[PDB]
Amino acid sequence: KKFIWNSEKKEFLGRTGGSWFKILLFYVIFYGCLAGIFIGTIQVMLLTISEFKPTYQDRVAPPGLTQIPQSQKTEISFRPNDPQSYESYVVSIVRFLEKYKDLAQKDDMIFEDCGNVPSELKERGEYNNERGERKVCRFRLEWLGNCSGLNDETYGYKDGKPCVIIKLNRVLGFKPKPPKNESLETYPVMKYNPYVLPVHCTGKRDEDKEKVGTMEYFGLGGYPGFPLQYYPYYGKLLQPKYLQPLMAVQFTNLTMDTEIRIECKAYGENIGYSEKDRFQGRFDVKIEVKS
Amino acid sequence: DPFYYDYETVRNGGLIFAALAFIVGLIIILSK
Amino acid sequence: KERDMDELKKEVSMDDHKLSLDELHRKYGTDLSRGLTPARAAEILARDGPNALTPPPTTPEWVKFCRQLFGGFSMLLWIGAILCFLAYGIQAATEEEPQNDNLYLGVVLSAVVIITGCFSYYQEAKSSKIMESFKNMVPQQALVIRNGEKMSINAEEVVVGDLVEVKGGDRIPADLRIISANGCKVDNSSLTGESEPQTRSPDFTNENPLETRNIAFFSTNCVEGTARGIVVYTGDRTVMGRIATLASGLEGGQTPIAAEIEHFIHIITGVAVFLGVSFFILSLILEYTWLEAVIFLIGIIVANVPEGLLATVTVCLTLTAKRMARKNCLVKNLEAVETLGSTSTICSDKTGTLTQNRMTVAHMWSDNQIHEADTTENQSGVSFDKTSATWLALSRIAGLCNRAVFQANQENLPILKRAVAGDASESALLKCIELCCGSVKEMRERYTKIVEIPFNSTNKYQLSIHKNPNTAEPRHLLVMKGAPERILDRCSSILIHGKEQPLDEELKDAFQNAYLELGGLGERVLGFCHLFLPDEQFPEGFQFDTDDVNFPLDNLCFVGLISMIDPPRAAVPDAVGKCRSAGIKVIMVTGDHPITAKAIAKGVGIISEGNETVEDIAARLNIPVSQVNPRDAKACVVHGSDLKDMTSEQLDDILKYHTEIVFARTSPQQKLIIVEGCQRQGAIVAVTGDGVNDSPASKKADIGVAMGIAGSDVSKQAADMILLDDNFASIVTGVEEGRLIFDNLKKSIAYTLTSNIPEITPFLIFIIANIPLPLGTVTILCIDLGTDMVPAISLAYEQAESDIMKRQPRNPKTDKLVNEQLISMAYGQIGMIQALGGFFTYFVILAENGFLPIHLLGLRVNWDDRWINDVEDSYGQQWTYEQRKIVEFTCHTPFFVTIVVVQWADLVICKTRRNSVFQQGMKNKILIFGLFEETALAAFLSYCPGMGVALRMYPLKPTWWFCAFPYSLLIFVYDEVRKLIIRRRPGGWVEKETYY
Numbered sequence A: 001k002k003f004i005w006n007s008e009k010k011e012f013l014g015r016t017g018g019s020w021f022k023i024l025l026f027y028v029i030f031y032g033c034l035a036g037i038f039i040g041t042i043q044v045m046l047l048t049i050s051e052f053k054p055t056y057q058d059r060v061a062p063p064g065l066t067q068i069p070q071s072q073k074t075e076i077s078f079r080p081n082d083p084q085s086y087e088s089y090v091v092s093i094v095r096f097l098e099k100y101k102d103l104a105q106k107d108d109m110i111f112e113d114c115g116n117v118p119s120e121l122k123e124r125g126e127y128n129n130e131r132g133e134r135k136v137c138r139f140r141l142e143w144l145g146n147c148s149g150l151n152d153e154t155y156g157y158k159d160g161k162p163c164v165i166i167k168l169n170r171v172l173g174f175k176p177k178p179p180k181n182e183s184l185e186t187y188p189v190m191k192y193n194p195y196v197l198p199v200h201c202t203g204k205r206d207e208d209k210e211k212v213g214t215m216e217y218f219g220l221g222g223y224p225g226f227p228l229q230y231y232p233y234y235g236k237l238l239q240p241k242y243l244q245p246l247m248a249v250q251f252t253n254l255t256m257d258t259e260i261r262i263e264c265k266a267y268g269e270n271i272g273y274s275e276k277d278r279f280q281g282r283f284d285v286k287i288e289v290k291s
Numbered sequence B: 001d002p003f004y005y006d007y008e009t010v011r012n013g014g015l016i017f018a019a020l021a022f023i024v025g026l027i028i029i030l031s032k
Numbered sequence C: 001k002e003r004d005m006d007e008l009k010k011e012v013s014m015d016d017h018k019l020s021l022d023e024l025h026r027k028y029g030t031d032l033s034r035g036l037t038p039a040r041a042a043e044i045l046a047r048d049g050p051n052a053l054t055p056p057p058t059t060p061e062w063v064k065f066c067r068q069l070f071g072g073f074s075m076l077l078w079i080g081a082i083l084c085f086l087a088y089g090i091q092a093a094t095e096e097e098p099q100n101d102n103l104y105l106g107v108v109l110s111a112v113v114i115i116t117g118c119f120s121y122y123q124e125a126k127s128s129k130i131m132e133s134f135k136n137m138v139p140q141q142a143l144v145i146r147n148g149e150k151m152s153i154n155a156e157e158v159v160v161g162d163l164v165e166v167k168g169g170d171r172i173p174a175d176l177r178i179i180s181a182n183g184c185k186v187d188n189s190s191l192t193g194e195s196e197p198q199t200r201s202p203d204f205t206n207e208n209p210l211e212t213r214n215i216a217f218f219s220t221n222c223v224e225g226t227a228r229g230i231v232v233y234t235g236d237r238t239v240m241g242r243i244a245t246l247a248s249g250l251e252g253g254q255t256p257i258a259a260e261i262e263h264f265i266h267i268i269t270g271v272a273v274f275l276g277v278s279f280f281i282l283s284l285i286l287e288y289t290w291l292e293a294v295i296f297l298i299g300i301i302v303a304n305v306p307e308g309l310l311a312t313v314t315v316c317l318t319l320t321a322k323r324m325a326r327k328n329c330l331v332k333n334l335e336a337v338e339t340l341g342s343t344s345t346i347c348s349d350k351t352g353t354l355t356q357n358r359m360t361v362a363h364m365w366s367d368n369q370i371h372e373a374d375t376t377e378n379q380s381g382v383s384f385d386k387t388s389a390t391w392l393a394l395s396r397i398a399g400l401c402n403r404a405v406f407q408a409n410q411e412n413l414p415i416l417k418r419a420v421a422g423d424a425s426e427s428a429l430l431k432c433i434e435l436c437c438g439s440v441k442e443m444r445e446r447y448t449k450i451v452e453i454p455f456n457s458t459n460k461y462q463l464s465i466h467k468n469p470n471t472a473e474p475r476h477l478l479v480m481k482g483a484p485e486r487i488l489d490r491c492s493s494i495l496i497h498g499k500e501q502p503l504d505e506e507l508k509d510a511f512q513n514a515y516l517e518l519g520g521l522g523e524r525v526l527g528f529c530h531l532f533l534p535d536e537q538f539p540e541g542f543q544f545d546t547d548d549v550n551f552p553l554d555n556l557c558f559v560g561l562i563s564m565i566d567p568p569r570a571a572v573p574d575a576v577g578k579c580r581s582a583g584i585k586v587i588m589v590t591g592d593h594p595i596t597a598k599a600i601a602k603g604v605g606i607i608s609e610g611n612e613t614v615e616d617i618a619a620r621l622n623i624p625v626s627q628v629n630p631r632d633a634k635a636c637v638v639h640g641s642d643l644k645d646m647t648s649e650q651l652d653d654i655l656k657y658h659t660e661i662v663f664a665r666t667s668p669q670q671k672l673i674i675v676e677g678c679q680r681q682g683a684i685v686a687v688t689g690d691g692v693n694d695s696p697a698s699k700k701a702d703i704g705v706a707m708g709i710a711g712s713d714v715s716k717q718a719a720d721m722i723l724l725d726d727n728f729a730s731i732v733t734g735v736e737e738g739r740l741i742f743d744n745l746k747k748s749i750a751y752t753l754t755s756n757i758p759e760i761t762p763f764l765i766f767i768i769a770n771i772p773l774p775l776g777t778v779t780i781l782c783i784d785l786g787t788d789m790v791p792a793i794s795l796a797y798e799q800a801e802s803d804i805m806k807r808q809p810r811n812p813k814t815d816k817l818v819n820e821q822l823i824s825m826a827y828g829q830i831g832m833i834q835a836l837g838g839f840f841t842y843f844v845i846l847a848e849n850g851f852l853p854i855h856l857l858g859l860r861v862n863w864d865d866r867w868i869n870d871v872e873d874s875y876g877q878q879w880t881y882e883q884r885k886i887v888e889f890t891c892h893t894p895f896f897v898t899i900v901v902v903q904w905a906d907l908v909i910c911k912t913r914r915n916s917v918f919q920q921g922m923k924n925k926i927l928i929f930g931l932f933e934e935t936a937l938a939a940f941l942s943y944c945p946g947m948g949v950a951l952r953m954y955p956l957k958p959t960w961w962f963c964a965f966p967y968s969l970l971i972f973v974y975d976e977v978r979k980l981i982i983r984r985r986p987g988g989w990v991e992k993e994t995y996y
């Protein structure tokens, strides 16, 4: 009963030739109309959104806190001697900072020299297209001392006492608001509370906090945070080649051959947290410099 | 701020809708 | 070696009844008047087994529970669960932090199978339990003569070769060989189907042990008279024992609904593995490793398995079976509720099934005029004229001259169903007089009987003389009844409207033609006459002792004939007509005499009035029967004697060229041969019976129907459906419901099979387009086993779109429960639109939250990564892992809502297969509640506190609820114009391609 393939009275795979053409023609017209309808409705959907602003922005309320070595498990395990052991780290650091070189930021028509001191927020009008392409404040690698250097094509980083820079999740129209001068116990921090988003790293328990001896932060003018002169963001369409602020963190006195947990928590009023998302506001890392 | 959504009012409205539609359906299958 | 054992049981029995009393007593070693010594009786009792059939094969309850856990559909869900745990083991041992999706899905599928098994088992167990409450097996002790003395012992203590005596009313214990009778009449209705009580004489009469009179049979009842006999067969070796043992050891077959479900799974898994394999090769051609492609293959195949269609189909069948149990039409097997509708040839039984199996006064003769009496089982028919003097005389002749009286408890019972003591003919007469002529108690004692004369062995006549209580004449009233040929010879006066007339041949021949009219109609006729004895020649003091001629045998006054026969049940003729209207071939199969079988066949509808048999044409032309061409005869009567000498081809031709067939004098084994002959044609068969002879016929039939009270226990157990009210119209109800639930199953299956496309397409394009997962697994569970359950269950309550009892029975080789028109609709057209609507809501959610649809290509690579917390959208924003995962899950929730929204339209269009939704109408309240509960539940799953934590279903922004509305409206309009072209143009395009 399963050899209905053909017969002398015509049938192929189950039906005749003239029937195969009728069904195929119908399905082609039917699916063609379905495709045109889906495309037309998806076009109306495209007409309901603008080019300079996402309609819903509540799902990114607390900005994240990422790092340069996008580790497979937020762990930094390498050998201070073997150059190939830490190649995966350095490669990502050089590629990340490849757009921050002095040669990359050379056009004066799209770049603006903000300043050597963190200042107030820089609002470039409204988010519409009435104004031309906004300017992006420059951020030279020299701001991150001891984690930038004037190295060649390969940034010879720190083998012993590694460097891990932090970055604030780029959000459109987000205006960072650092904590009030009434700081509710934010550990040792500089008095430059009004024009920089503070970020403080620490261990996770009584063990990690003891293993991590000394940490040295690097930022704009020497402040451990992000300057307010670089915010808010005006989208990729209006501000291409934008350079969000960066801030490096070096762990000088570490206990070699020991995996220790570090939690870099960014503080501020407009910075939320989440017990489910360990990246919203805070940031974790598992460093282990095994010799 | 545009970084906030009144999820409690929408959630509350959805739960009231779910309650009313179910009790109405129960009245539908109880024709008396 | 059971094959030979069953073959020696399919053969009609043999015997040694044709033996002289001396040869019999020498073969068995038994005294003809003393039986045997009790020690010899116990020596045999403990040698071959007590006189009782071996109990049925007990069916332990864990066996049938494990049976409900298996099958064909539950097995597909079992292989699905197995594939889920295999895929989970692969995903566990091969990759980091494996997901528990496949494991939870496998345990859910296993739970689905177990729960369906629990429900179906509880239903079948309920049917069997309420069936056990009908076994009212009362022990019956037999009267056995042993060692020269009469003793009454239990029926099981009876052995072979011992004298046994039976009295009118007692049941024949074992198979006896009569040795001496005294006007003894037994009842061979439950065994050989012989309606009228066949007498039993010690002389051998027929070569067939069933037809001869020297054999009493197991489970038969000695109606009247007393007799003696030697037990020839005992226990299971008996006639009805071999019939019952054959019934238990027969094959049940494969019900049509089961074959439809099996082919359905053939198509389900066919497209499932086609998609799985083609996409396995496609995924390997893209980039994914064998580890990933194997998981893709299993995911696509498992996804194409209707997880909830099992529970919906079980509830569907259960609902229709509930309606069957409401009308006292219980089904033992659940799927048996569908088989009646698919039937196309009903083989019925006459005695006890087509008829009432009870002698009833059929017609009467008065004033040279035939008067038909009401013969319905509940007395709901035309009443004859009961105001003439001829009736007032005939009624007294019958009510007085009759040895029939009611018993003790015969008070609250109706006039017909009550028990009467005596002859069956006298019982019918007593009931007819007690029904159409007031009461016979005070009417019988009103005429004090003086001297009577019972029935004679030759010239059978029954007469009696009574006193006259009339207030105008003291003459003695003499009455007599008997065969019309015996009364015509002893009659000279004829009553008419109150006066008398001579025996002129002008009306005497008119009496003869009436006798042959009521006789040729298959009925048994009797003649009644009376006369006024002159009180001058026989005064009130004279005593007419029964010795000499004290009464004038001749010169009597004939009043009229009274015929009688077992009448068919009330709704039997109309029901047969309804079945023939539905294209069901009605074939009578009975062991009764052909002269009566043909009459009942013409009377119920098996033989249409006007159609002629092969013998009728030869009689109308006065030519030999061997001359007429059988092609000129539509109907045909086939005798059992002739049936024994038939081949397979001959029986095939009998069923192929004759449209109205009646098998008469057929043995139970031949009944089985006939049922098999009907099944050879390829048509669904339903056997409707009551006696033990219907056990091998009800068992082998596609569906057996036993009478709940007038039936025997063996045929009741070997059957698949029981009629607890014996209302034969329940067969019509069944054939209607069997088609109704068939169409509704089609609609509900197309409904569950439509949601598969939007359930699988997200994963398909997820593999192809490399976009984030549009639909989640737990949400799919909330659709298949959550929302959709109530709508699919409500789709069973749909009514007929046109008259189903008008269309012909479905062809099993053509009208499949799931044809390519349903696959072309669900998988091809409706499910496709539903999938596009789901993807539309998907792209809306992502484009509105910052991820334009064009940007979603190749994004899943980094989207699914758990550590890249800076994933750029279309606006340059950086999304963490949990943030974008929150969007993906809050994107799965509206996809699920979109499914519900398009299921609104799919349910409304699936509700009607050909009619318009306005023609049929949203009158289905369960469907209305289905949509209200479906939507309310879908909304609850999204807005209940803690669902984004438990089920990972997050609340929706209200505009999401409207992204699916246009797709639903489109679905509804498309299917509506589809059914419109099906209505206006019934030729072929929209009908043979989409109408399923």
Ligand SMILES: C[C@@H]1O[C@@H](O[C@H]2C[C@@H](O)[C@]3(CO)[C@H]4[C@H](O)C[C@]5(C)[C@@H](C6=CC(=O)OC6)CC[C@]5(O)[C@@H]4CC[C@]3(O)C2)[C@H](O)[C@H](O)[C@H]1O
Pocket: C091, C099, C101, C102, C105, C292, C295, C296, C298, C299, C300, C302, C303, C304, C763, C773, C776, C777, C780, C864
């Ligand atoms: C390439 C691959 O993509 C991701 O995994 C993918 C494979 C696998 O993991 C699962 C979870 O097991 C699959 C599973 O197989 C099959 C399904 C149960 C299937 C069915 C629905 C149904 O009704 O029956 C079957 C539809 C998709 C499905 O619901 C899930 C969806 C989540 C996913 O996670 C997706 C991960 O990111 C992974 O790490 C990466 O290697």
Ligand SMILES: *[C@@H]1O[C@H](CO)[C@@H](O[C@@H]2O[C@H](CO)[C@@H](O)[C@H](O)[C@H]2NC(C)=O)[C@H](O)[C@H]1NC(C)=O
Pocket: A145, A146, A216
């Ligand atoms: C950057 O690294 C240099 C080493 O190359 C550090 O320079 C040393 O600083 C200490 C004081 O902390 C002096 O005692 C040493 O003599 C310096 N050595 C050299 C070679 O210059 C410098 O301190 C580091 N900068 C920061 C901010 O930590």
Ligand SMILES: *[C@@H]1O[C@H](CO)[C@@H](O[C@@H]2O[C@H](CO)[C@@H](O)[C@H](O)[C@H]2NC(C)=O)[C@H](O)[C@H]1NC(C)=O
Pocket: A213, A214, A253
């Ligand atoms: C850097 O860490 C080292 C420990 O690794 C500190 O030196 C130790 O001090 C303890 C006493 O507290 C001694 O028992 C150890 O022998 C010391 N170890 C070494 C290698 O010197 C050191 O003080 C830390 N320095 C800074 C600047 O934090």
Ligand SMILES: CC(C)CCC[C@@H](C)[C@H]1CC[C@H]2[C@@H]3CC=C4C[C@@H](O)CC[C@]4(C)[C@H]3CC[C@]12C
Pocket: A041, A044, A045, A048, C844, C959, C960, C962, C963, C966
């Ligand atoms: C001319 C008629 C028959 C076409 C029927 C389809 C119409 C009613 C459909 C096509 C595309 C649909 C729109 C698709 C996109 C959006 C964005 C969504 O977040 C809210 C709904 C909204 C605003 C829809 C409203 C209904 C809509 C306009």
Ligand SMILES: CC(C)CCC[C@@H](C)[C@H]1CC[C@H]2[C@@H]3CC=C4C[C@@H](O)CC[C@]4(C)[C@H]3CC[C@]12C
Pocket: B009, B010, B011, B012, B013, B014, B015, B017, C935, C939, C957, C958, C959, C961, C962
């Ligand atoms: C085809 C027609 C008749 C269906 C009638 C029911 C429609 C109108 C109902 C079904 C589900 C309903 C939605 C249920 C849930 C939500 C969330 C709530 O917080 C606001 C209302 C909103 C957005 C409802 C709008 C009206 C809605 C779409």
Ligand SMILES: *[C@@H]1O[C@H](CO)[C@@H](O)[C@H](O)[C@H]1NC(C)=O
Pocket: A181, A191, A193, A194
């Ligand atoms: C915060 O307070 C300190 C003294 O407690 C003061 O020196 C500093 O200027 C204050 N900063 C602001 C922004 O008020």
Ligand SMILES: [Mg+2]
Pocket: C189, C190, C193, C349, C350, C351, C352, C353, C689, C690, C691
């Ligand atoms: Mg019968």
Ligand SMILES: [Mg+2]
Pocket: C303, C305, C306, C307, C755, C756, C759, C784
């Ligand atoms: Mg499904």
Ligand code: NA
Pocket: C251, C252, C253, C698, C699, C700, C701, C702, C703, C704, C719, C720
């Ligand atoms: Na059966």
